[PDB]
Design a protein around this ligand. Sequence first.
Ligand SMILES: Nc1nc2c(ncn2[C@@H]2O[C@H](COP(=O)(O)OP(=O)(O)O)[C@@H](O)[C@H]2O)c(=O)[nH]1
Ligand SMILES: NC(=O)c1c(F)ccc(OCc2cccc(Cl)c2)c1F
Ligand SMILES: [K+]
Length: 307
Amino acid sequence: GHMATLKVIGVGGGGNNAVNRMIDHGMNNVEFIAINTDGQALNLSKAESKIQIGEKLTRGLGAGANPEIGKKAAEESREQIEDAIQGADMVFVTSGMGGGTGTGAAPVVAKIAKEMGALTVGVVTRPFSFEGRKRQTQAAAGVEAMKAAVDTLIVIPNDRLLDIVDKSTPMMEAFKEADNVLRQGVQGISDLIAVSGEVNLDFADVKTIMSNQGSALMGIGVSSGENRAVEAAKKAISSPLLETSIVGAQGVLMNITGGESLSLFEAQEAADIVQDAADEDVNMIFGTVINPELQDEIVVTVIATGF
Ligand SMILES: Nc1nc2c(ncn2[C@@H]2O[C@H](COP(=O)(O)OP(=O)(O)O)[C@@H](O)[C@H]2O)c(=O)[nH]1
Ligand SMILES: NC(=O)c1c(F)ccc(OCc2cccc(Cl)c2)c1F
Ligand SMILES: [K+]
């Protein structure tokens, strides 16, 4: 009876916004931690655990867009960060790259989590092009530092949100689409840990696919009716919001959930959709859950890594 301990850690403004909106949803058995220099924003966090970093350095303000201040702030507070991560088996570090606190502190937070043996996944945004080339260059250095500090990294270029809005779509509605990348990845692992599958996968399979593996994709597809299996598999690997596509994937963890009508043939169809993109020598871990509460709906979930 192994019950993996998951923690989601927001770092900086954007990261903690995403955590707050996640908490507004129904997320149980995940621990949320909020880390910021900005005391004003931190006080409005909904997370159980709040860590104000760098208070001596910033006097309670943010980092003023200076990543070196974010980095020093996280180092000043290393012990408080260690204490908050204690017990974690898996840590999601979420942050908006390009500012001061996220860019600088998020790699330190991820390094501490990995030092403590936790499976460490980064979920970060790149700035909009309209924020300017300098912010983009600063964010790019953050991404590289995250790569060197995490097991696996998911990068969401904010420019991709401009591909899914019309001219009137509210900004907050667009942000919720980016939030969903994190929410569905965390919820997917939670489901995998809690549910016993007819072909059962568990946290050790997640570790094999995600430990020290670079870029990652975490997707989910839901469909019904004819060709449901193919359509759900296509949805799970085709997010318009990710920087890393599934082409060339060297590891894949894949699960299909459906009712008692789930057929062997459609399991093959869904797996073939994913294989046709991945490397021919991909390490594929395939699972299946039969949820008789379901009727015609089928859910395909995919973790892809190794490029
Ligand atoms: N998608 C999304 N991006 C955000 C959000 N908040 C900030 N960003 C992006 O994150 C970058 C860093 O901003 P922020 O996190 O506030 O800076 P920091 O607190 O100094 O780390 C910005 O340049 C934006 O590109 C948010 O709520 N959603
Ligand atoms: N076969 C299982 O034990 C199982 C289960 F009983 C529930 C969920 C599972 O996978 C969820 C998942 C997979 C890939 C990506 C993501 Cl995000 C989520 C499973 F593999
Ligand atoms: K399971």
